[PDB]
Amino acid sequence: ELRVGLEESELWLRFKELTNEMIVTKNGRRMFPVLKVNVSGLDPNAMYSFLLDFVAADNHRWKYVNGEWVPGGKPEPQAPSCVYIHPDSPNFGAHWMKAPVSFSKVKLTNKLNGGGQIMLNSLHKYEPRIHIVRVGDPQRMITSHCFPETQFIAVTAYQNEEITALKIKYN
Numbered sequence: 001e002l003r004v005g006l007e008e009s010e011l012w013l014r015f016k017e018l019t020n021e022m023i024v025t026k027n028g029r030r031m032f033p034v035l036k037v038n039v040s041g042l043d044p045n046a047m048y049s050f051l052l053d054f055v056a057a058d059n060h061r062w063k064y065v066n067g068e069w070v071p072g073g074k075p076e077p078q079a080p081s082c083v084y085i086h087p088d089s090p091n092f093g094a095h096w097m098k099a100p101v102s103f104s105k106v107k108l109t110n111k112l113n114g115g116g117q118i119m120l121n122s123l124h125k126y127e128p129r130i131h132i133v134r135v136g137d138p139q140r141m142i143t144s145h146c147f148p149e150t151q152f153i154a155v156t157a158y159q160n161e162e163i164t165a166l167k168i169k170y171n
């Protein structure tokens with residue numbers, strides 16, 4: 001049976017208990033921690049593509065007030081649909097299952113300046129989601145997998161000094 005498990009969940013939960021933050025910039029910024037998953041239950045003989053997108057978590061934005069994340073007003077219009085294709089795609093199920101699948105090269109940005117980056121709105125909370133797509137499937141079956149341990153708020157600069165120190169400590 002298809003099983004997708006989050007790698008280094010303990011490290012993600014350290015950031016989440018502080019409310020995790022990810023920097024977005026004009027040219028795009030890579031994530032820390034990096035989203036990595038282990039996969040089992042795929043057909044090793046079949047070929048698949050791994051896709052990544054980011055889902056909004058609330059219908060409001062956030063603000064850091066008195067060292068505390070609080071609801072910070074009505075949200076901006078939803079960011080456009082941005083899908084990141086894992087550069088190993090398409091590949092055999094045996095490839096995806098022999099070692100954890102890392103999305104280390106994806107970049108988060110606040111501009112639609114191309115480059116295959118992910119457009120996010122600052123001060124909004126997002127949750128990464130992974131999609132698995134089989135090549136050649138007339139039913140075009142797709143599997144979606146959410147990871148609530150990896151939720152974060154997009155920021156142009158770190159608000160929580162504990163988050164700033166955490167990023168330096170483990171990266």
Ligand SMILES: NC(=O)c1cccc(C(=O)N2C[C@@H](C(=O)O)c3ccccc32)c1
Binds near residue numbers: 041042043046138142
């Ligand atoms: N009748 C059908 O359900 C059917 C028939 C042929 C191919 C698929 C397919 O694309 N799968 C199966 C499954 C697999 O390959 O592990 C899978 C995992 C992720 C994404 C797609 C798919 C589904």
